[PDB]
Amino acid sequence: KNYTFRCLQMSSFANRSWSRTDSVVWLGDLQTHRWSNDSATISFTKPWSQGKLSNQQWEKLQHMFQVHRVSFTRDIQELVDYPIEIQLSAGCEMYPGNASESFLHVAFQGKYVVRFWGTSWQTVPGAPSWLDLPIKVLNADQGTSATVQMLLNDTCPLFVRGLLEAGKSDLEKQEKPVAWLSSVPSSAHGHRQLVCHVSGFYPKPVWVMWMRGDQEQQGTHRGDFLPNADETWYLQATLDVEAGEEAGLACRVKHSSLGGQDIILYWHHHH
């Protein structure tokens, strides 16, 4: 009900005579495109990565990006203390009722410094003062400005509507997790960390809790959401318990793909 479309550019400049630019594109948590420095063309990572664009519309868009890639590399080394890391994050958030919001953020050495907002490039408060003149030069190019405004206001939302239609079965896919229990060393002396592993679930939203009967063990620590290589998610929920306290504990998993039938693993089931 709120798909974030992100085009990520990663540019490294080691010196005057060495640079590479690599790009990835995400629709939510699914990669739709890859564009290595090695490759002349943008690679599809889905069957539906062209959306509802004809070949002609895609070739035009791709060509514009090929021009942007080469112009960017030249313009940066024109202006340019190596090495230099530049990141670009451009796309749109799609909301219900045919609504959206577009963005274009630029980072220098891992710090947010520039965005495109409204009709112009602007340095963010606290950005190095030496950026102000380059940004005024860049803002003199009305063609580039008009092109960015088109891409953010028109092309982004239009394209992503096409992806959402073309990629429906992937975006709506339901993958059931497998769960298993283990223990690891606790940082507390009399204790061991009980671990409930949940792997292979999609979409991302999940609920994992240690239970004594119907009582939630509210000390349950939810780990970070970690990616599997097959476009599914991994998560572990941990509970540090004293020796003997393990008896009668269960891990309970809720997920959309289980359709009401929760996974319940009891600790020491086979004793």
Partner 1 sequence: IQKTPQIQVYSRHPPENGKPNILNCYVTQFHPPHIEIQMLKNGKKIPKVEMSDMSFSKDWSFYILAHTEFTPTETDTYACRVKHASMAEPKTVYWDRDM
Ligand X SMILES: *[C@@H]1O[C@H](CO[C@@H]2O[C@@H](C)[C@@H](O)[C@@H](O)[C@@H]2O)[C@@H](O[C@@H]2O[C@H](CO)[C@@H](O[C@@H]3O[C@H](CO[C@H]4O[C@H](CO)[C@@H](O)[C@H](O)[C@@H]4O)[C@@H](O)[C@H](O[C@H]4O[C@H](CO)[C@@H](O)[C@H](O)[C@@H]4O)[C@@H]3O)[C@H](O)[C@H]2NC(C)=O)[C@H](O)[C@H]1NC(C)=O
Ligand Y SMILES: *[C@@H]1O[C@H](CO)[C@@H](O[C@@H]2O[C@H](CO)[C@@H](O[C@@H]3O[C@H](CO[C@H]4O[C@H](CO)[C@@H](O)[C@H](O)[C@@H]4O)[C@@H](O)[C@H](O[C@H]4O[C@H](CO)[C@@H](O)[C@H](O)[C@@H]4O)[C@@H]3O)[C@H](O)[C@H]2NC(C)=O)[C@H](O)[C@H]1NC(C)=O
Ligand Z SMILES: CCCCCCCCCCCCCCCC(=O)O
Q: Which residues bind ligand 7LP (CB under 6 A)?
A: 64, 67-68, 71-72, 75-76, 79, 86, 90, 106, 108, 114, 131, 134, 138, 141, 143-144, 147-148
Q: How far is the CB of 154 from ligand Z (least distance, A)?
A: 9
Q: Which distant-in-sequence residues (6+ apart) come within 8 Å of 66 by Cβ?
A: 40
d(CA 179, CA 183) in angstroms, rounded, equals 14
Q: Does 118 bind ligand X (CB under 6 A)?
A: yes
Shortest separation between residue 12's beta carbon and ligand Y, angstroms: 19
Tokens 């992806």 sit on residue? 163
* Distance between CA atoms of residues 114 and 131, nearest Å: 9
Sole binder of ligand Z in the list 27, 30, 88, 237 (CB under 6 A):
88
Contact between 14 and ligand NAG per CB under 6 A: yes
| In the chain, beta strands by DSSP E | 4-15, 18-27, 30-35, 43-44, 84-95, 99-108, 111-117, 120-123, 178-185, 191-201, 207-212, 215-216, 221-222, 226-227, 233-242, 249-254, 263-266
Residue 30 beta carbon to partner 1: minimum distance, rounded to whole angstroms: 12
60's contact among ligand Y, ligand NAG, ligand Z, none, with CB below 5 to 8 A by partner kind, is none
With CA atoms as reference, report the closest residue to 235 among 180, 173, 193. Answer: 180
Using CB under 6 A as the binding criterion, the count of chain residues that bind ligand NAG stands at: 6
The Cα 184–Cα 206 span in angstroms is 23
Stretch touching partner 1 by CB under 8 A, among 54-62, 134-142, 178-186, 208-216? 178-186
Binding mask 65-84 for ligand Z (x = CB under 6 A): x--xx---------------
User: Which residues would be at the binding site for ligand Z (CB under 6 A)?
Assistant: 7, 9, 21, 23, 25, 33, 35, 42, 61, 65, 68-69, 88, 90-91, 104, 151, 155-156, 159
